[PDB]
Amino acid sequence: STGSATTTPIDSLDDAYITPVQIGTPAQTLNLDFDTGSSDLWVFSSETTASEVDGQTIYTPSKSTTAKLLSGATWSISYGDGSSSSGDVYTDTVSVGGLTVTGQAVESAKKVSSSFTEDSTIDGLLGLAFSTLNTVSPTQQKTFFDNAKASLDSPVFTADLGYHAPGTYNFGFIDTTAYTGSITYTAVSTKQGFWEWTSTGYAVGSGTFKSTSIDGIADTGTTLLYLPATVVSAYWAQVSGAKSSSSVGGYVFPCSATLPSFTFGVGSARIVIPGDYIDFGPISTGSSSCFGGIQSSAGIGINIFGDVALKAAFVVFNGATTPTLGFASK
């Protein structure tokens, strides 16, 4: 079996992507943020504190004939941006683009932090990292991908994110028409629960490629590309007036600049991020300072190949016994 669903940017900056997901019987369609950097499928629900819900569509397990309380199970998760959520757990039928998993753990939010409440278009998250990161206690739960895996034609999912445009998440197959050239596969470490891999280097604009190992995670749930301070300073040094601002929380550049491209290595292959993908617009409306799409990973503890990088490629998340990541130009 296979699944295919369209993913759409939530705003004019590609701050996040939402993908419709059907939950329960009759179906309740929620728009979830597919996140390869977490492993919990959680939703805004009829149990979420009324003052913490602002425009979101909620999951009502009492209206689903297939919902069952996962008795005693609770979840509690904190994300790198400081946001958090917690609640109880149900099992229900979950379908993504025609691919159905019965008995999927659906983590109902009892509490969400302000960052979740204010994103009216995001009804929850669908975790696609390894199930070892799942926060369900005392019985740890499997992701939608993990649960679907045996039924899939191929144990894979692919992320084809668009730049200011919709894209696609495919499950169980590789669409050979969605990319050009070949897909370069690279080793994955599952030791921290992430799609953690090693980039072979980088180039800034038309500059020469520097062969250097950069460990990092392929994370659809992170908007920007976070890399070591050395790499990020070398990129922003090519943009006149660009500087790192402590008041803004990162690198900004004059909105009048035309940004150079950024190339990252995947084995002997190269993925080119056009300069336009690195422009996140004015820091505040009307501002002449624009926010950079490439930021330092210094305060995080891990390098993150977020949407800025992933949207420049057709990306394969190979969940076979020995997991690998595939990258192709598109």
Curated annotation (Swiss-Prot):
Q: Name one GO biological process term.
A: proteolysis
State the EC number(s): 3.4.23.22
The entry's keywords: Aspartyl protease, Disulfide bond, Hydrolase, Protease, Signal, Zymogen
What reaction does this catalyse?
Hydrolysis of proteins with specificity similar to that of pepsin A, prefers hydrophobic residues at P1 and P1', but does not cleave 14-Ala-|-Leu-15 in the B chain of insulin or Z-Glu-Tyr. Clots milk
Q: List the disulfide bonds.
A: 255-290
Molecular function GO terms recorded: aspartic-type endopeptidase activity
- Specify the Peptidase A1 domain's residue ranges: 17-328
Domain of life of the source: Eukaryota
Identify the catalytic residues. Answer: 35, 199
Protein family: Belongs to the peptidase A1 family.
Would you tell me the protein name for this molecule?
Endothiapepsin
